[PDB]
Nucleic acid binder design. Structure first.
Ligand SMILES: [Ca+2]
Ligand SMILES: [Ca+2]
Ligand SMILES: [Ca+2]
Lengths: 152, 152
DNA sequence: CGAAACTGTCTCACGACGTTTTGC
DNA sequence: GCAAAACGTCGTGAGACAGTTTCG
């Protein structure tokens, strides 16, 4: 439950609004009660020759990791608890991705809840829809509508 | 000669390191003495549906303008004086583009002497080589080397 | 089972120039 | 003659997912 310096949050919020992404996904997966996993991800993408900057975010944020994918790299943070702590503090300084950060926080708080009702889980999936709508979504497939394959 | 708020600068620096570009160019033009114009530009690019963010920047920075170019728009700041003032205050919070910022600042401060000595003009055209090397330059064509057509 | 990771890629939304036209 | 504006383009450097797997 680390407390972040405001100057750091202000700059990073700007950077996140730029090269960052706040993602919410519904991943079909049979091992789950509702045959889908609710996935949340905070990420920052950057050309690999500049990964030092992402590695630094790992150290500064105190959690997450950097993944290499060729000419580009990403700082990824998915652990729900640290993500909630982080987005809570980052959120007030965001200008382009604040709505989605808030939706993510809202989803996180409703996870245990939605993981018990086919309709509560479906409501949460509705939140995921909104986040995707707010992002420049171009290759999305699984939506709350598709999860509504739960009826039967 | 406007003084910007620190939290505004902190956020913007991060956003600039993300979607911005600090540019220096040598534009071949016959109307100039040394057949080239020293052009400097600070710009922030964004998908046109988010043009409001760029329009808002024009108000917050107090100078500059937004141009449209298809699916994308750009906030542009070229006026050398407000540019110098703006970058002077932003530069300390930059992390990926701090070097190019200080170089632009330096080019501006040396512009006057650059007009006289055809040799100082080439040394300034050096500063611009440096800036392009720092950016992810890939379509550049006019360098200090080409300027050396100042040999007759 | 389920939190989180490992792995790959579609379609841009940017970055970083260049070329031309003004205007004092 | 130089500053600032206009208008147009190369080649990504991002964003935003998808899909399958690890293992307490
Ligand atoms: Ca962006
Ligand atoms: Ca960037
Ligand atoms: Ca970007």
């Amino acid at each position: 439950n680390t407390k972040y310096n405001k100057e750091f949050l202000l700059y990073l919020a700007g950077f996140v609004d730029g090269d960052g992404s706040i993602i919410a996904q519904i991943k079909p997966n049979q091992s789950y009660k509702f045959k889908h996993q609710l996935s949340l991800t905070f990420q920052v993408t950057q050309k690999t020759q500049r990964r030092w900057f992402l590695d630094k975010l790992v150290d500064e944020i105190g959690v997450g990791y950097v993944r290499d994918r060729g000419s580009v790299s990403d700082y990824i943070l998915s652990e729900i608890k640290p993500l909630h702590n982080f987005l809570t503090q980052l959120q007030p300084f965001l200008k382009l991705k604040q709505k989605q950060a808030n939706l993510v926080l809202k989803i996180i708080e409703q996870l245990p809840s939605a993981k018990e009702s086919p309709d509560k889980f479906l409501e949460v999936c509705t939140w995921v829809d909104q986040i995707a709508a707010l992002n420049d979504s171009k290759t999305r497939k699984t939506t709350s509508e598709t999860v509504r394959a739960v009826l039967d």
